Structure 1
Amino acid sequence: KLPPGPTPLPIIGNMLQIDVKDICKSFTNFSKVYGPVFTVYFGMNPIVVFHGYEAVKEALIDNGEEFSGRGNSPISQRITKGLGIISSNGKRWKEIRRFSLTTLRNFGMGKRSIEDRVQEEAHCLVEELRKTKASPCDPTFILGCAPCNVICSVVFQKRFDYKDQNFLTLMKRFNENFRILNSPWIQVCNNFPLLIDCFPGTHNKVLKNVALTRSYIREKVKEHQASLDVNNPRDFIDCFLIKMEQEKDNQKSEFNIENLVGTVADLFVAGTETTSTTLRYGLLLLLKHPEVTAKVQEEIDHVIGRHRSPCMQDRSHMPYTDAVVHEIQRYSDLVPTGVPHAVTTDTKFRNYLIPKGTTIMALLTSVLHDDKEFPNPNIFDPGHFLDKNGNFKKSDYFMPFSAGKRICAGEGLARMELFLFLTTILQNFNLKSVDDLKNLNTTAVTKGIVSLPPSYQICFIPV
């Protein structure tokens, strides 16, 4: 007894009824007819959609174990092979994630904290921006280099110089693969596997980049193996290699070189383009809202000053900036459909029964835009996370990282990168628009797995 939904056509399901360019819009329209929980078919594949806070919470949190599975696809299994953290399930997922979470703690990988790595990067970032000489530029590239380098310093210990060719090509490959995987065409191909044959060049391009990135990570890990100091872990790779030694006797161990390469790649995949996009969107919203930027820079002046680089301790004394960062994530709505889940067993949800392995879609965007929790949800307003006295007001509806047992495995790092990159940038620069601010639109242009802000130019004027 699956939840009701639009009547599917024999082979293509409800595909012709949904806009592949803005699936969330189609799902939202369906919730107005069928309610908070409904079933749609993409080809022969059923997908139960959860719309609204009550439905999303009950699924991801109150029935967390049952809803902790990762909804997989033919393309995912072909790229990852079920290795790593993003696309794995069962025992492998639990072990790799548990380890990943503990080593991604601020001091979970040695004497050097993750925060110190992000601060060094925030510093290198402001220096690259100074080289633009306050002239108009598309910040896309420079803003993408920082989060990528953060992951690099987290897994390879040392960051790369921005001019390093190995860094440049490594970044271009992840960029190429991101663009292909962000296309509405992958939705069609995942549900109609035969159509993948209609894209030989793209298929080969993706496979090639994954192969090259794989061998690169493997060359890096071999370097770590021949210089490992068990008492002094330098990064993520050292920690994994140390765990592998402790599990050397057990042959049914998930901690092997195969899962290590996949996990490192996954951190890059899940942590580079997502943070980069939020950083771009953030600067766009700050550019468009001068009044908001001013109050943030004022709070920075008061709590941090002009002679010291910001740090995470400062966030506790900067409620407005915290509210701004939260509002940037709520408004930007990066992953509107969330990442697909799958129930681990036959699950009972209210008066419905969802069979094992069925794909789950918890609409994060429907929570982020709840019109009661956030009056006027389509307006960017830091007040949505501020109380009557200007203090930070937390929200149960703040789910940009999803919720439950599968919530973003790098949420702390993500929030840290956002707070630090934005405060360090605004401490050293003012944001100038080329044209009039009225002409600047902030509505997301594309919505296919990852919502992207419109293209824009900006001038970084040193304070």
Structure 2
Amino acid sequence: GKLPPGPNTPYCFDQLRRRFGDVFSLQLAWTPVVVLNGLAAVREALVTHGEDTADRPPVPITQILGFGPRSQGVFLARYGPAWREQRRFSVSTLRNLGLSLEQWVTEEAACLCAAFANHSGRPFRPNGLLDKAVSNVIASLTCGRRFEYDDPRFLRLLDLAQEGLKEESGFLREVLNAVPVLLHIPALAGKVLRFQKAFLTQLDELLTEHRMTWDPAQPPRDLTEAFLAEMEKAKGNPESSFNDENLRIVVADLFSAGMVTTSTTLAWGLLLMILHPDVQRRVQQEIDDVIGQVRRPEMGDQAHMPYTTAVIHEVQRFGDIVPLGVTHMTSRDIEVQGFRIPKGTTLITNLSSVLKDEAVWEKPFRFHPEHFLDAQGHFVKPEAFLPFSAGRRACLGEPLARMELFLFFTSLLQHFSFSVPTGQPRPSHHGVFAFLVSPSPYELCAVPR
């Protein structure tokens, strides 16, 4: 079996793809890595061989966060029953709460609009408030409450989360994962994940309060209550993943996976609306013709707003916030584009190469909403639209994220006209790579309509 050819990062991989093709390999430290580029490669790996590519590479430092065999959360959980039980529970719970989450999102959108209006037309960076609105949607899903935009514990929670994102990058974490033995030195153990650990600690305090107000004689109001109820039925069952050590991990996974993604996406959205005011006006025209100017947007509006739906999809395509997705690990030998992938290889899915594929999209490096329209103005979704990846491990947040993007974006453009402040440089459309790819900082003016 022949192996893939091969010898900041997103540009580098797209460079190597040019040189060695769509499936190439690397040795990143002591990890054999295979990178997949383009729709064909990614689907072959994640769908056709989806059974064998749905594992995660082990992360030894998660011991520090209370992880264990039946306590792996969902995002990093190894392929196996502790992942599948929590995967199915979150997917189902999200779905059940639809029957609601939309009500929580819609209320949050009105809170956000009111917070935007308080800037009375003066320039401001939108990011802070977008984070808060998006964080309160997760708060609503997980604990059945929101927090005020100036609640002290709410702000510390978001602060801890931002600092915890940074801890995903570093020399220290790379060494400790390589040799988990170094974790016996307390000086090192206490430093690796101090912000993520502090987040969980702050979270415990919220979960303890929620556990006091839970009414178990009523149907669960939110996901923590659904979990607690499952935890009751599972007392006496050492096989269950429904336990107090997993609860805090699963809820931390939903916050930390769901905040920065949806928020960054919305930040790209507003930036592209001030760089392309003509798209903005067309969206505001479609809003006026379908929704009007008083009534709050509802999810039922989306099927009648093909242009707004195109724009929101193009924001995700152009924004391309998670260029390299989330790593997978193979649990069996597989074949991709002919090449042999050994068991235990880390797979990197180059989602950027799918979203920006020049063979598929008309002008992939332009902001071009017609990427999702046909000449008639019908919304069409190409198969290369994979901002959430594919297969068994594809973003379980996707239905909620879709709801948030549509209800936050259209609520905002319903009530405000957005522009570049009249004395500043046209902000760049080029992102800042980090954990996520986010817009380079900008301010905007939001004036009522």
- Provide the TM-score with structure 1 as the length reference: 0.89
In structure 2, the partner of 1:371 is 358
In structure 1, the partner of 2:74 is 85
In structure 2, the partner of 1:270 is 257
Counterpart selection for 2:139 from 149, 152, 167: 152
Q: Which runs of 5+ in 1 are unaligned?
A: 8-21
- For residues 12 and 230 of structure 2, the distance between their equivalents in structure 1, rounded to whole angstroms, comes to 46
The question of whether the paired residues in 2 share the 8 Å contact of 1:109 and 1:239 is answered with no
Question: By how many angstroms is 1:191 displaced?
Answer: 7.5
- For residues 231 and 299 of structure 2, the distance between their equivalents in structure 1, rounded to whole angstroms, comes to 32
**For each residue in 1:282-314, what CA deviation from the matched residue of structure 2 results, as whole angstroms up to 9, or x when unmatched?**
100011000000010111111111120001110
**How do 1:55-454 and structure 2 match up within 5 A?**
55-76=41-62, 78-79=64-65, 81=67, 83-89=72-78, 90-105=80-95, 108-109=96-97, 113-181=100-168, 183=169, 204=190, 207-226=193-212, 227-435=214-422, 439-444=426-431, 446-454=432-440
**Closer/same/farther in 2, CA of residues 261 and 287 from structure 1, 3 Å limit:** same
Amino acid at match of 1:95: E
In structure 2, the partner of 1:17 is none
- For residues 11 and 261 of structure 2, the distance between their equivalents in structure 1, rounded to whole angstroms, comes to 21
In structure 1, the partner of 2:37 is 51
- For residues 98 and 284 of structure 2, the distance between their equivalents in structure 1, rounded to whole angstroms, comes to 33
- For residues 330 and 81 of structure 2, the distance between their equivalents in structure 1, rounded to whole angstroms, comes to 15
In structure 2, the partner of 1:4 is 4
Alignment partner of 1:280: what SS?
A: helix
Question: By how many angstroms is 1:6 displaced?
Answer: 3.0
Alignment partner of 1:461: what SS?
A: strand
**Percent identical across equivalent pairs?**
41
Amino acid at match of 2:30: M
- For residues 146 and 104 of structure 2, the distance between their equivalents in structure 1, rounded to whole angstroms, comes to 8
The question of whether the paired residues in 2 share the 8 Å contact of 1:110 and 1:233 is answered with no
Alignment partner of 2:228: what SS?
A: helix
Question: By how many angstroms is 1:23 displaced?
Answer: 1.4
Question: By how many angstroms is 1:232 displaced?
Answer: 2.4
- For residues 27 and 192 of structure 1, the distance between their equivalents in structure 2, rounded to whole angstroms, comes to 24
The question of whether the paired residues in 2 share the 8 Å contact of 1:42 and 1:191 is answered with no
Question: By how many angstroms is 1:409 displaced?
Answer: 1.0
- Provide the TM-score with structure 2 as the length reference: 0.92
Alignment partner of 1:378: what SS?
A: coil
Amino acid at match of 2:47: I
**Closer/same/farther in 2, CA of residues 278 and 350 from structure 1, 3 Å limit:** closer
- For residues 197 and 176 of structure 2, the distance between their equivalents in structure 1, rounded to whole angstroms, comes to 21
Amino acid at match of 2:83: W
Amino acid at match of 1:219: E
**For each residue in 1:367-422, what CA deviation from the matched residue of structure 2 results, as whole angstroms up to 9, or x when unmatched?**
00111221110000100000110010111100111111111010011111111111
- For residues 110 and 60 of structure 1, the distance between their equivalents in structure 2, rounded to whole angstroms, comes to 28
In structure 2, the partner of 1:37 is 23
- For residues 436 and 59 of structure 1, the distance between their equivalents in structure 2, rounded to whole angstroms, comes to 49
Alignment partner of 2:193: what SS?
A: helix
Alignment partner of 1:389: what SS?
A: coil
- For residues 296 and 437 of structure 1, the distance between their equivalents in structure 2, rounded to whole angstroms, comes to 25
Amino acid at match of 1:104: L
The question of whether the paired residues in 2 share the 8 Å contact of 1:184 and 1:448 is answered with no
Amino acid at match of 2:430: T
Q: Which runs of 5+ in 2 are unaligned?
A: none
**For each residue in 1:160-214, what CA deviation from the matched residue of structure 2 results, as whole angstroms up to 9, or x when unmatched?**
1111111111111101112343x475786578669x99xx999746633333332
Alignment partner of 1:371: what SS?
A: coil
Amino acid at match of 1:81: F
- For residues 341 and 135 of structure 2, the distance between their equivalents in structure 1, rounded to whole angstroms, comes to 39
The question of whether the paired residues in 2 share the 8 Å contact of 1:110 and 1:232 is answered with no
